[PDB]
Design a binder for this molecule. Structure first.
Ligand SMILES: Cn1nccc1C(=O)NCc1cccs1
Length: 284
């Protein structure tokens, strides 16, 4: 079926939970043996969220190459994304090592450091220009260059230096700051505006390594971001945009990381975002 009318048909029939459970039943199951080794327990935020072995990002290190991060490679859309958990106190150096080694231009953050009165990820970037951060375990230096605070998101320019070679690179930090502590946003308008700002920066384009996207577990809000982006790109590429099947795209992405889209409310929000986004693209 088309998307917008499949949408109203699920609303009128109140069957979002049943649709979402079907997706969960059909999703791929692949091994995640490296994630479950005992030496990696303090590298995982949640015991039930792990990268598959076949798609995990490897650190360029001979001691321990493990990070909780996955490469989502979308062949028809010609887009790739790295989805990862919010960094932990003992993995902030690994996180920036990955950004460096994978040649990423941008980092997309969809959570606040504290939500619901608890810490959802480490404070992994510097908050003042004159107070830079040094990660001694991976030999990197990170400096805040500029910060632009808007009503729904903040954009930061960061300098990442590899202290071993003295090479430097500019990294863009796109921080969506207004996702509610409970539920999903009422309107997708500010989330779509944010996605378009990430696109306009070049961070999603083929001349750079894959964008790094995270929330707390790296599967819920993070899944919504890449699902909406890929679906809109396919609607632009195909002769028949109504052929794009958001459930099929989501199942394809779940071949690369488990659990993408965590609730039926996030599934409905993803439909809403793609539907509204397709009108603004045109041609309107
Ligand atoms: C050390 N350890 N033993 C078992 C599990 C862990 C662990 O590091 N878990 C992740 C988190 C640490 C602190 C906040 S979340």
């Amino acid at each position: 079926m088309e998307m917008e009318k499949e949408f109203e048909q699920i609303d009128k029939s109140g069957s979002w939970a049943a649709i979402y459970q079907d997706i969960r039943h059909e999703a791929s199951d692949f091994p995640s043996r490296v994630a479950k080794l005992p030496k990696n327990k303090n590298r995982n935020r949640y015991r039930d969220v792990s990268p598959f072995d076949h798609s995990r990002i490897k650190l360029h290190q001979e001691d321990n190459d493990y990070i909780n991060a996955s490469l989502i490679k979308m062949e028809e859309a010609q887009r790739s994304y790295i989805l990862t958990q919010g960094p932990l106190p003992n993995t902030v150096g690994h996180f920036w090592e990955m950004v460096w080694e994978q040649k990423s231009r941008g980092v997309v953050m969809l959570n606040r450091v504290m939500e619901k009165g608890s810490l959802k990820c480490a404070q992994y970037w510097p908050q003042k220009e004159e107070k830079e951060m040094i990660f001694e375990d991976t030999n990197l230096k990170l400096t805040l260059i500029s910060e632009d605070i808007k009503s729904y998101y903040t954009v930061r320019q960061l300098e990442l230096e590899n202290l071993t070679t003295q090479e430097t690179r500019e990294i863009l930090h796109f921080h969506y700051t207004t996702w509610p502590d409970f539920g999903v946003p009422e309107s997708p308008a500010s989330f779509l505006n944010f996605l378009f700002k990430v696109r306009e920066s070049g961070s999603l384009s083929p001349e750079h390594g894959p964008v790094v996207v995270h929330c707390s577990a790296g599967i819920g809000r993070s899944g919504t971001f890449c699902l909406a982006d890929t679906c809109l790109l396919l609607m632009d590429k195909r002769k028949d945009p109504s052929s794009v099947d958001i459930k099929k795209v989501l199942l394809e992405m779940r071949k690369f990381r488990m659990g993408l889209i965590q609730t039926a409310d996030q599934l409905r929000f993803s439909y809403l975002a793609v539907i509204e986004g397709a009108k603004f693209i045109m041609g309107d």
